[PDB]
Amino acid sequence: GKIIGIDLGTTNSCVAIMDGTTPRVLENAEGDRTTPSIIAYTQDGETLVGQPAKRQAVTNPQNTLFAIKRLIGRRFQDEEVQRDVSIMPFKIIAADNGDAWVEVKGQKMAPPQISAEVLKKMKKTAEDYLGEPVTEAVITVPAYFNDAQRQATKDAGRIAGLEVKCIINEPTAAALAYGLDKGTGNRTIAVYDLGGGAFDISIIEIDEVDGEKTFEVLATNGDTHLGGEDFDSRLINYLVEEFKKDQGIDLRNDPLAMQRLKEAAEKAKIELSSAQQTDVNLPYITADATGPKHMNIKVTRAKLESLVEDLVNRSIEPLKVALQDAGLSVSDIDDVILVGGQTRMPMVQKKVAEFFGKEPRKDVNPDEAVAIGAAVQGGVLTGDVKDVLLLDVTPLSLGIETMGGVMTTLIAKNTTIPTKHSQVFSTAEDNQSAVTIHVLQGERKRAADNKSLGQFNLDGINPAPRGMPQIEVTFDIDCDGILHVSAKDKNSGKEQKITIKASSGLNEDEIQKMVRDAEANAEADRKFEELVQTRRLLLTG
């Protein structure tokens, strides 16, 4: 029946639903509109999720899992996983297949199983509110997630007992939330998302034509090293160094103390968005031969700002790239939307307002907008939300090079995503044993006048006259905008494939120039294609 929207966060998760025309963020049993993304396995056999898991973490560092979003869909040898292994107090292991897993109480578990526990709590929160079963969900992911990260998030959804109707990017969700307000049509917005796990920036166009409001991503990127956990780490390091200076003890080899110090640091960081100073007070933090030792360290806001200044400044460069990739100036951004708990830091707000020259909108809730927008997309799919469309179309034609240096289109410009199209090709020479699939992007008919996106070989073709072998070429663009190209020899069974990342932006200024350029050269391109075609389309070596 109803489709719920779930923000599966590194730090916090949130669930929302469409209640007729207006979205509703749903409270859990303690009364909370967000739930810590924390899962704990206790000595007496319980599985805790949320605030109960958080409260017993500082005593159970081994069997309390958090920040599992940093692992999901990743390989054990991935750079980020290895960086994560040390800092995490729980055991991160390699699965038999090379995926990054965790081990708790001797049980080896895949991240989607762990995240499913958070998603089940979200589902139940919703089922409790509706008095009915819920099984359909829109789940969000960072815009930087790849296919494996998305698929694994879909898995966690299923393991939680959810039909995953849709995965959408978090900044897009926030834009749908904002785009519920009136007067927001025909605007460009910047979505500045500083969460617990990463920084993301997206430039999104909200247009309104013939009653339909459309949402289209013009640029995205970010940095997984600029999240609130990185802010926390700078303050932890300062608290470690200050305790060394005050009392000559290095807390880093004492896991229980470091766990208490991590939580205290985060709470102090949070408090310093409201106050000018705060006190970190941790009695019985450690002991040496002379008895127990106690921490009491005052931290001013200016000191915090000094500790994280470089982190905040490093968020500016991805903004500049995002605007370049959309072909826009700051003067084209009609509104700035802050998403994420870490944007509540006053220094972050001021730096963003300085860059854009305007104050971020204040009627967007940075903890809830992602979950709200996911619910909006849910209502779009059920038909409860009318006249709202997420627009994802190919900017330019996509194809391969064929004989004569021709670009042969498989997917035409302005095709809606996701999409899949196949065409069968053959060989250009008798007894040709291999073909080269050269993937091309653009509107020109000569392959060399278009952009090369990648290439690969298919060999093992059995000897046969030119034109006889059947090479099926498939272009599949998934919802993440990732292009999958395969080539399969139907008679030998051999197949080869590649994956082509989505572009970081859609620069309509440059796209329309390329379109006009092709139109200016249409006749020349037509004549070119014709007297080459006087020779089923064929592939050279």
Ligand X SMILES: Nc1ncnc2c1ncn2[C@@H]1O[C@H](COP(=O)(O)OP(=O)(O)OP(=O)(O)O)[C@@H](O)[C@H]1O
CB of 269 or CB of 413, closer to ligand X: 269
25: nearest Cα among 379, 381, 368, 370: 368
Task: For 493, list phi and psi in degrees, rounded to 5.
Answer: 80, -5
- CB-neighbour burial class of residue 332 (10 A; exposed 0-12, middle 13-18, buried 19+): middle
CA–CA distance, 114 with 118 (Å, rounded to integer): 7
- Tell which one of 50, 111, 179, 197 touches ligand X (CB under 6 A): 197
Nearer CB in complex with Mg ion: 196/399: 196
For residue 299, which phi and psi values (nearest 5 degrees)?
Answer: -125, 120
Q: Does 341 bind ligand X (CB under 6 A)?
A: yes
Catalytic position from the list 117, 170, 266, 325? 170
Between 41 and 192, whose beta carbon lies closer to ligand X? 192
| Residue 227 partner contact from ligand X, Mg ion, none using kind-dependent CB cut-offs of 5 to 8 Å | ligand X
Query: Between 52 and 81, how does the x/- string for binding to ligand X read (CB under 6 A)?
Result: -----------------x------------
Q: Is 170 a catalytic residue?
A: yes
Among 179, 195, 360, 379, binds Mg ion (CB under 5 A): 195
Respond yes or no: is residue 525 known to be catalytic: no
- In the list ligand X, Mg ion, none, the entry touching 12 (Cβ below 5 to 8 angstroms by class) is ligand X
Most distant CA pair in the chain, distance: 94
CB-based contact 169:142 (threshold 8 Å): yes
Q: List binders of Mg ion among 1-30 (CB under 5 A).
A: 9
**397 neighbors 409 (Cβ within 8 angstroms):** yes
| 387 catalytic per annotation | no
State yes or no: residue 73 binds Mg ion (CB under 5 A): no
Which one of Mg ion, ligand X, none interacts with residue 269, CB within 5 to 8 A by kind?
Answer: ligand X
Concerning whether 293 is annotated as a catalytic residue, the answer is no
Nearer to ligand X, 270 or 464 (CB): 270
- DSSP one-letter code for 56: T
Given 99, 155, 193, 368, which residue is catalytic?
193
Could you tell me which stretch among 93-101, 193-201, 244-252, 457-465 binds ligand X (CB under 6 A)? Answer: 193-201
According to the binding rule CB under 5 A, does residue 36 interact with Mg ion?
no
9/442 with CB nearer ligand X: 9
The residue from 7, 155, 205, 266 that is catalytic is 7
- HEC string for 442-506: CCCCEHHHCEEEEEEEEECCCCCCCCCCCEEEEEEECCCCCEEEEEEECCCCCEEEEEECCCCEC
CB of 271 to ligand X, least distance (A): 8
Find the binder of ligand X among 342, 402, 409, 450 (CB under 6 A). Answer: 342
Q: Which structure tokens are listed for 488?
A: 């399969």
Q: How many CB atoms lie within 10 A of CB 133?
A: 11
Select the residue interacting with ligand X from 340, 378, 379, 442 (CB under 6 A). 340
Q: Is 504 in contact with 203 (CB distance < 8 Å)?
A: no
Contact partner, 198, from Mg ion, ligand X, none, Cβ < 5-8 Å per class: ligand X
**Is the CB of residue 168 less than 8 Å from the CB of residue 374?**
yes
Where are the extended beta strands (E) located within 21-145? 22-25, 35-36, 38-41, 47-49, 64-66, 91-94, 100-104, 107-109, 136-141
196 binds ligand X (CB under 6 A): yes
> What is the SS3 assignment for 273?
coil
Q: State which of residues 270, 388, 391, 532 lies at the interface with ligand X (CB under 6 A).
A: 270
Q: Which DSSP symbol is given to 5?
A: E
The reply on whether position 9 binds ligand X by CB under 6 A is yes
Binding mask 425-464 for ligand X (x = CB under 6 A): ----------------------------------------
Tokens of 305: 């700002």
> Rounded to an integer, what distance in angstroms lies between the CA atom of residue 499 and that of residue 294?
55
Q: Which is nearer to ligand X, 214 or 224 (CB)?
A: 224
| 529 burial type by CB count under 10 A (0-12 exposed, 13-18 middle, 19+ buried) | middle
Of the candidate spans 113-121, 191-199, 222-230, 509-517, the one that interacts with Mg ion by CB under 5 A turns out to be 191-199
Residue placing its CB nearer to ligand X in the complex, 23 or 195:
195
Nearest Cα neighbor of 517 from 452, 451, 454 is 451
Q: What secondary structure letter does DSSP report for 55?
A: H
Subset of residues 209 to 268 that bind ligand X, contact rule: CB under 6 A: 227-229, 266
> Helix (H, G, I), strand (E, B), or coil: what is residue 378?
helix
Separation CA 13–CA 163 (nearest Å): 18
String of contacts with Mg ion for each residue 400-439, x by CB under 5 A:
----------------------------------------
Shortest CB 498 distance to ligand X, Å: 29
Taking the C-alpha atoms of residue 208 and residue 79, their distance in angstroms, rounded to an integer, is 43
List the catalytic residues: 7, 69, 170, 193
Residues that bind Mg ion (CB under 5 A): 9, 195
Contact positions vs ligand X (CB under 6 A): 9-12, 69, 195-198, 227-229, 266, 269-270, 273, 340-342, 344-345, 367
